[PDB]
Amino acid sequence: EYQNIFSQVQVRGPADLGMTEDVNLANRSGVGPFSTLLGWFGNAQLGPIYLGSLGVLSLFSGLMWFFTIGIWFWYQAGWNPAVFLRDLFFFSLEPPAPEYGLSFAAPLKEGGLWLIASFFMFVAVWSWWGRTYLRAQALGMGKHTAWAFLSAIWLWMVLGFIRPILMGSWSEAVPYGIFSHLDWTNNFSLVHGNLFYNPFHGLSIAFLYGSALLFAMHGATILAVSRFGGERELEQIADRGTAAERAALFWRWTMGFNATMEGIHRWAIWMAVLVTLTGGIGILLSGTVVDNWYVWGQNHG
Amino acid sequence: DLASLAIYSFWIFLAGLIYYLQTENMREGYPLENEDGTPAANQGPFPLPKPKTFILPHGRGTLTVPGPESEDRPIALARTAVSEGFPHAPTGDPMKDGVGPASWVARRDLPELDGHGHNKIKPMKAAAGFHVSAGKNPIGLPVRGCDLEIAGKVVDIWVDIPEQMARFLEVELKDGSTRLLPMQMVKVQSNRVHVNALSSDLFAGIPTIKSPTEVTLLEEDKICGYVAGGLMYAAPKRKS
Amino acid sequence: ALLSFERKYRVPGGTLVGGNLFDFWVGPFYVGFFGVATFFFAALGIILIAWSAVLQGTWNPQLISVYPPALEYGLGGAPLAKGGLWQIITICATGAFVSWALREVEICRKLGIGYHIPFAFAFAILAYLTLVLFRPVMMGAWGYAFPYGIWTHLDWVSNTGYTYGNFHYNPAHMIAISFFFTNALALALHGALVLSAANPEKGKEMRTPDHEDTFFRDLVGYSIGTLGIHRLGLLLSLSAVFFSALCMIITGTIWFDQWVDWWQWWVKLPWWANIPGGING
Ligand code: BCL
Ligand code: BCL
Ligand code: BCL
Ligand SMILES: CC[C@H]1c2cc3[nH]c4c(c3C)C(=O)[C@H](C(=O)OC)c4c3nc(cc4[nH]c(cc(n2)[C@@H]1C)c(C(C)=O)c4C)[C@@H](C)[C@@H]3CCC(=O)OC/C=C(\C)CCC[C@H](C)CCC[C@H](C)CCCC(C)C
Ligand SMILES: COC(C)(C)C/C=C/C(C)=C/C=C/C(C)=C/C=C/C(C)=C/C=C\C=C(C)\C=C\C=C(/C)CC/C=C(\C)CCC=C(C)C
Ligand SMILES: CCCCCCCCCCCC[N+](C)(C)[O-]
Ligand SMILES: CCCCCCCCCCCC[N+](C)(C)[O-]
Ligand SMILES: CCCCCCCCCCCC[N+](C)(C)[O-]
Ligand SMILES: CCCCCCCCCCCC[N+](C)(C)[O-]
Ligand SMILES: CCCCCCCCCCCC[N+](C)(C)[O-]
Ligand SMILES: [Cl-]
Ligand SMILES: [Fe+3]
C-alpha cells in the first residue's frame, strides 16, 4: 500500500512556457531551473514568472517597505551586527503617538518612518491585488483568486487603516516587529474586555478550524481516489468518473450528505474567505461601537 | 445597536449561503432513487438547482447539470434481502462485471486533451524528450503479483505531458500483449515492481486499450476500477 | 434513497468485525459493527451529560459544564458529582471518536479507496487525548484537563494560557499558528483556482489544468500542481494540529515558567550577551 504523499519516479520534459491566450509574452521571463527536491512533492519547474509594470511597481514598493523597517532595526541596534541578530525579535517600528492623531506631520524618529513604511506596504499589496485580477483576465479565467484575496486585504485594511481612522489616531495601528505585534494582539484583547466575548472573533475561529478540517478532508479524499485519477478535478467535473462517485459515496455513507467535484471547491473558497471576513468586522466594531465585549455580552446589545 | 444588527445580519446571510452551497452540490447524483431505480418519494428539503452549461474545449460541445442520469451499462447485482438498505450481491464475477470496488463509469471513450488539444497521456517512447529525472527507473523491471509470482515486465512509463508526471506503467505479459497499471497502485522497488491489488493470474483480465499510443477516459476508468477491485476480490491469493 | 450511481457500489464485504452481521445501511448512512459502537458510546455519553446538567440545576446549553475532578483527587476516580461524570464521559467520547475512525476504515475497504481520511482524522483524536489524557497524566491530575462546556472550555483556554504569561511566546504554538494561517491561504487559493478554471469569463470554454499551472507561474513563478496542492493541504492541516499537541505536551511538564522568559536562551548566548545597546542591555 504505497500512499502517494511523495512520487516514486520523476519524469522531465522540455520546460513549459505555459498557455498564451491574451498574455503579452514580452513580459514573461525565461524558465528558471528544475528542482528534484520540489519534484518529489509537486512540480519540479521554477518559472517562468510574468513581470509587467504592476509586478515591478509592487515588487519595488514591497522591498522599500521591508528595507524601511530593516534600516530602523539597524539604527536601534546602534549599527552593530551582533546586537541586530541578538535583538531581531525585540526591535519594532511603532506608529506615531496619540498626540499626532491622524496627521502625517510626526517626525521620522516618532512614527513618521512608520507612515513611510505603511505607504509603501499599501501600494505594494493593492498593486499585487490588481496583478491577481489582470493575470487571470489575460488567461480568460474567473476572478475568484482576486475576490478571495480581497477578503484577506479586508482584515489588513481594517487593522492598520480603516479602524485607526475611525478611532482618529495612527497609534491604534499595528507596529512592524516580531514580538511587538504579538504584544499589540494580546494587549488589544485586554483593553476590549476579552475578544473571546466578541462573537465575530468566535466565528473567525470556527472558520479557521473549518479550513483546517475541510482541507484535511478534501486533501485526504483526493489522495484516496488518486488511483482513479481524482486529482484531475476539471475533467471529473466535465465527465464524472468512479473517482468522483467513490469520493462522494465515502462521505454520504460516513455523514449522510456529500459534495460534487465542483461543489467541494465552493465549500472550500467560502470556508476560507469567511475567516478574514468575520475577522475584519469583529476588529472594526472593537473600540468604534463596542468598548468592552464582556459588557456588550451581558446585554447581548 | 450596530453590533447586534451586524451579527443577526450575518446569521441570516450564513443560512442563505449554506442553502446556496447545498443546492450547488446536487448537480450530480440527484434526484435520489429507490434500489429499483425509480425516483424516491422523499428527496430532502433542498430543491434541484437551475441547470448550468459548461462549454467543453476542443469542440467536445457542452455539459448541462443537473441533467438526465443513467449508468449506460448493465449492473450484474441482485438483492440479498426483501427490504431497502442491504448489500446487493454480484450475480457474476464482480471483477469482470465491474461492480463494487471494481466499478467503472461510462465516461467519454475519448482521451483527455491538454490545453493545446494534444493527448494528455502518451507512452514516454512517443514523448520527445521525456526521461526519468529522479528515483528508480521502473522500465525493464519484472512485475510481481500479491501471490509473489512474476506476471510481466515494465516496457514503458505513460506520462502526463503538461503536469510532467508518470500515470501508468505499461506491462508486457507472458503472452506478448501489454496492459496499463495505475502508478498509484504499484511499489517500485530496487529489483522489481510489486502489485498488492492483483495476483499474477488476474493481470490477463486487466482491460486492454483499443489504440497503443492513447488511453480514453472510459479505458482509464475500466483499468483503474479493475485494479482497485483486486484488493477485495483477489484477497484469497494475497500472501505476506 | 440512493444517488443515481450508488447501487453498483453497495456490494457486501469490507467489515473488520462481525462479517455480514452489521453490513447494511440506514438511509444514506453505512452502519457496521463500529456504527453500533459509535451510537452506544454517543447515546450513553449524552445521557451522562443530561444527568450532569440535573445535578448542576440547569438545562441551559450555554451554562451546562461538566468539570474534571479537583487537583487533590490526582489521577484517581472521583464521585460522579465532583469529576467522575467527566471521567466516564471522557471514556465515552474517546470510544465514539475511535469507533468513528474505524467505521471510516470499513467504508474505505468497501469502496477500494486509500485510508488517508481516517489517518488524517486520527491526528484530531490525538490532539483531544493530549489535552484530556496525556498532559493531565504527565502532570499528575485529571484537574489540568479542560471542562466540557461551550463557554467554560474558553474560560480554561484563557486561564491555562495566561498561567504562562502571554502564551504567544510558546515557540511550538508560534509554528502551529503559522501552519493554520498558511493552510487557510492554501484552501482559499485551491478553491479559487479550480472555480476560476471551471467558471471562466462569460461565453468562454472551460480552462485546463495548463491554464491553472500557467496562472500561478505568471503570478509567483511557481505552480505546485494538481496532485501537489492536495498533498500540501493534507500536510499543512495535519502539521498545524501536530505542533498544537506538541505546544501543550511541553507546557506544564518540561516548561512551567513564563514562556516569554524561555527566549533568554538566545539573548544571553555568550558572544553577544554583554555587547551594549539594542533592546537588551
Ligand atoms: C482547539 C483548542 C481548544 C478550543 C478552543 C476554542 C476557541 C478559542 C473557540 C472554540 C470554539 C468552539 N469550540 Mg473549541 N476548543 C477546544 C476543543 C473543542 C472540542 C473537543 C476537543 O472536544 C469541541 C467539540 C469544541 C467545540 C467548539 C465549538 C462549540 C466552537 C466552534 C468549533 C468549530 O467551529 O470547529 C470547526 C468544526 C466545524 C465547523 C464542524 C462543526 C462542529 C460543531 C460546530 C461542533 C458542535 C459541538 C457541540 C456543541 C458539542 C456537544 C454535542 C454532543 C453531541 C453532546 N472545541 C480546545 C480545548 N474553541 C469557538 C466558540 O465559538 O466557542 C464558544 C471559539 O472561539
Ligand atoms: C491574547 C490574544 C487574544 C486574541 C486577540 C486577537 C486580535 C487582536 C485579533 C485576533 C484575530 C484572530 N484570532 Mg485571536 N485572540 C485570542 C485567542 C485566539 C485563539 C485561541 C485561544 O486558541 C485562536 C484560535 C484565535 C484565532 C484568531 C483568528 C481566527 C483571527 C485571525 C484570522 C487570520 O487568519 O489572521 C491572519 C490573516 C491576516 C492578518 C491577513 C493578512 C493579509 C495581508 C494582505 C498579507 C500581507 C503580507 C505582506 C505583504 C508580507 C509578505 C511577506 C512574504 C512575501 C511572505 N485567537 C486571544 C483571546 N485575535 C484577528 C481577528 O480577526 O479578530 C477577530 C485579530 O485582529
Ligand atoms: C489567552 C489564550 C492564549 C492561547 C492559549 C492556548 C491554550 C491553553 C491552548 C491553545 C491552543 C492553540 N492555540 Mg492558542 N492561545 C492564544 C492565542 C492564539 C492565537 C491568536 C491569533 O492569538 C491563535 C491563532 C492560537 C491558535 C492555537 C492553536 C495552535 C491551538 C489550538 C488548535 C488545536 O489544538 O486543534 C486541535 C483540535 C481538537 C482538540 C479538536 C478535536 C475534535 C474531536 C477529535 C472530535 C469532536 C467531535 C464532536 C464532539 C462532534 C460534535 C457532533 C457533530 C457536529 C455531529 N492561539 C492566547 C494568547 N492556546 C491549544 C492547543 O495547542 O491544544 C493542543 C491549547 O490547549
Ligand atoms: C486534523 C485536522 C483537522 C480535522 C480533521 C478531521 N476531522 C474529522 C475528520 C478529519 C479528517 C473526519 O473524517 C471526521 C468527519 O466525519 O468529518 C466530517 C471529523 C470530525 N471532526 C469533527 C469535529 C471537529 N474537528 C476539529 C478539528 C480538526 N479536525 C482539525 C483542525 C474540531 C475543532 C477545531 O474543534 C472539531 C469540532 C466532527 C464533525 C467529526 C467527528 C465526529 C465523530 O467523532 O462522531 C462520533 C461521535 C459523536 C457523534 C459525538 C459523541 C458525543 C460525546 C460522546 C459526548 C460529548 C463529549 C465532548 C468532549 C463534548 C465537549 C463539548 C464542549 C467542548 C463544547
Ligand atoms: C538585514 O538588512 C536588510 C537589508 C535585509 C533589511 C532588513 C529587513 C528586516 C529585518 C525586516 C523585518 C521586518 C519585519 C519583522 C516586519 C514585520 C511586520 C509585521 C509583523 C506586520 C504586521 C501587521 C501589519 C499591518 C496590520 C499593517 C497594515 C498596513 C496598512 C493597512 C497600510 C496603512 C497605510 C498608511 C497608514 C499610510 C496611508 C497614507 C497614504 C498617503 C494613503
Ligand atoms: C513541501 C516542499 C518541500 C518538500 C521536499 C521533501 C522531499 C522528500 C523526499 C522524499 C525521498 C524520496 N523517497 C524515498 C520518498 O522516494
Ligand atoms: C515560491 C517562490 C518561487 C520563485 C521562483 C522564481 C523563478 C523566476 C525565474 C527567473 C529566471 C531567471 N534566470 C536567469 C534564472 O533564468
Ligand atoms: C461554510 C459554512 C460552515 C458553517 C460553520 C458554522 C459553525 C458554528 C460556529 C458557532 C459559533 C457561535 N458563536 C459562539 C461564535 O456565536
Ligand atoms: C450545529 C452543527 C451540527 C450540524 C449537523 C448536521 C448533520 C447533517 C446530517 C444529514 C442527514 C440528513 N438525512 C438523514 C435526511 O439524510
Ligand atoms: C456546518 C454546516 C454543514 C451542514 C449543512 C447541512 C446540510 C445538510 C444536507 C442534507 C441533504 C441530504 N439529501 C437528502 C439532499 O441527500
Ligand atoms: Cl507531521
Ligand atoms: Fe481539489
Residue B199 has φ and ψ, to the nearest 5°, of -85, 155
Judged by a CB distance cut-off of 8 A, whether residue B4 touches chain A is: yes
Domain ranges of chain A: 53-191, 202-284
CA distance A268 to B14: 15
> Distance (Å) from the C-alpha of residue C111 to the closest C-alpha of chain B?
5
Q: Could you give the CA distance from residue A73 to residue A178 in angstroms, rounded to a whole number?
A: 11
Q: What grid cell was written down for C72?
A: 487533590
Do the Cβ atoms of B133 and A11 come closer than 8 Å?
yes
Question: Which of ligand 6's atoms lies nearest the C-alpha of A41?
Answer: 4
Contacts of C239 by beta carbon, 8 Å cutoff, 6+ apart? C179
Instruction: State how far the Cα of A111 lies from the Cα of C209, in Å rounded to an integer.
Output: 47
DSSP secondary structure letters along chain C = -B-TT-GGG--S---SSSTTSS--EETTEE--HHHHHHHHHHHHHHHHHHHHHHHHT---TTT--BPPPPGGGTTS---GGGTHHHHHHHHHHHHHHHHHHHHHHHHHHHHT--SHHHHHHHHHHHHHHIIIIIHHHHHT-GGGSPPBSTTHHHHHHHHHHHHTSSGGG-HHHHHHHHHHHHHHHHHHHHHHHHHHHHS-STT-----HHHHHHHHHHHHSB---HHHHHHHHHHHHHHHHHHHHHHHHSBTTTB-S-HHHHTHHHHT-TTTTT--SSS--
- What is the rounded CA–CA span in Å between residue A273 and residue A147? 9
Which residues are bridge partners to C148 per DSSP?
Answer: C66
How does DSSP assign chain A, residue by residue? ---SSS-S-EEE-S------TT--GGGB-----B-HHHHTTS--BB---B--HHHHHHHHHHHHHHHHHHHHHHHHTTT-HHHHHHSTTT--B----GGGTT-S-S-GGGTHHHHHHHHHHHHHHHHHHHHHHHHHHHHT--SHHHHHHHHHHHHHHIIIIIHHHHHT-GGGS--BSHHHHHHHHHHHHHHTT-GGG-HHHHHHHHHHHHHHHHHHHHHHHHHHTGGGTTT-HHHHHHS--HHHHHHHHHHHHHHS----TTHHHHHHHHHHHHHHHHHHHHHHTBTTTBS-HHHHHHHT-
Paired residues of B68 in beta bridges? none
Q: Tell me the ligand closest to A49's alpha carbon.
A: 7
Nearest ligand for residue A205 CA:
2
Q: Do A240 and B112 touch (CB under 8 A)?
A: no
Give the ligand 10 atom nearest the CA of B46: 15
What are the C-alpha distances in Å from B176 to residues B141, B172, B203?
A: 16, 6, 12
How many Å apart are CA C216 and CA A211, to the nearest integer?
A: 21
Is the separation of the CB atoms in C204 and B53 below 8 Å?
A: no
Q: Which of A42, A247, A272 sits opposite C224 (nearest CB)?
A: A42
Question: What class is the A202-284 domain?
Answer: mainly alpha
Contacts 24+ apart (CB under 8 A), C22-26: C23/B87, C24/B85, C24/B86, C24/B87, C25/A253, C25/B85, C25/B86, C26/B85
Domains along the sequence of chain B with CATH = 2-90 (4.10.540.10), 100-237 (3.90.50.10)
* Chain A residues lying within 8 Å of C262, measured CB to CB: none
Question: Which of A80, A212, A220 has its CB closest to that of C117?
Answer: A220
Which mutation among C36, C94, C100, C146 tests ligand 4's pocket best, with the greatest number of atoms within 8 A of CB?
C100
Task: Tell me if A53-191 shares its fold with A202-284.
Answer: yes
Nearest to C23 among B87, B113, B163 (CB): B87
Determine if residue A265 is labeled as part of a ligand binding site. Answer: yes
Residue B240: CB atoms within 10 A of its CB come to 5
- Quickly list DSSP for B160-190: ETTTTEEEEEEEEETTS-EEEEEGGG-EE-S
Q: Determine contact, residues A237/A17, Cβ cutoff 8 Å.
A: no
Count the Cβ atoms, other than its own, within 10 Å of residue C268: 12
Neighbours of B239 (CB within 10 A): 8
Query: For atom 6 of ligand 8, which residue has the closest CA?
Result: A206
- Beta-ladder partners of B171: B154, B179
CATH classification (class only), A53-191: mainly alpha
For residues C51 and C77, is the Cβ–Cβ distance under 8 A? no
| Beta pairing, strands B142-144 & B193-194 | parallel
Q: Would the CB atoms of A11 and B1 count as touching at under 8 Å?
A: no
Give backbone dihedrals phi and psi of C130, rounded to 5 degrees, phi first: -55, -55
To the nearest 10°, report the CA torsion of B65, B69, B73, B78: 140
Inform me whether the C-beta atom of residue B217 falls under 8 Å from chain C C-beta atoms.
no
Does ligand 10 lie within 6 Å of residue B47's CB atom? no
Ligand index nearest the alpha carbon of residue A165: 5
Residue B163 with chain A: CB contacts under 8 Å: 43
Question: What residues does B169 pair with on adjacent strands?
Answer: B157, B181
Compute the distance between CA of residue C72 and CA of residue B229 in angstroms, rounded to an integer: 57
Q: For residue A207, report the distance from its CA to the centre of ligand 2, in Å.
A: 12
Give the separation between CA C250 and CA A193, rounded to whole angstroms. 29
Closest partner residue to A241 (CB to CB) among B107, B183, B228 is B107
Ligand 6 atom with least separation from CA of A6 = 15
Inter-chain residue contact A270 with B196, CB threshold 8 Å: no
Whether residue A190 has its Cβ less than 6 Å from ligand 6: no
Between chain B and chain C, the number of residue pairs with CB atoms below 8 A apart is 116
**Closest residue of chain A to B188, computed from CA coordinates:** A8
Contacts of C208 in chain A (CB under 8 A): 19, 234
- Which residues does a 6 A CB cutoff place in the pocket of ligand 2? A 125, 152-153, 155-156, 159, 185-186, 188-189, 195-196, 200-201, 204-205, 208, 275-276, 279, 282-283; C 157, 181, 184
Q: Which DSSP string do the residues of A238-290 spell out, in sequence order? A: HS--HHHHHHHHHHHHHHS----TTHHHHHHHHHHHHHHHHHHHHHHTBTTTB
Q: Where are the domains of chain C?
A: 1-163, 164-263
List, chain by chain if needed, residues with CB within 6 Å of any ligand 4 atom.
A 209, 212-213, 216-217, 220, 254-255; C 38, 41-42, 45, 89, 92-93, 96-97, 100, 104, 117, 120-121, 123-124, 148, 150, 153, 237-238, 241
Structure's resolution in angstroms:
3.1
Q: Which of C2, C8, C26 to mutate to test the interface with B (most CBs of B within 10 A)?
A: C8
Pick C198's closest partner by Cβ from B54, B102, B114: B54
**In whole angstroms, how far apart are CA C106 and each of A118, A217, B39, B79?**
55, 17, 28, 21
User: Which residues lie below 8 Å from residue C120, measured CB to CB, with a gap of 6+?
Assistant: A216, A217, A219, A220, C234, C237, C238
Q: Cβ contacts (< 8 Å) between B89 and chain C: which residues?
A: 11-12
For cell 505585534, what's the residue? Answer: A181
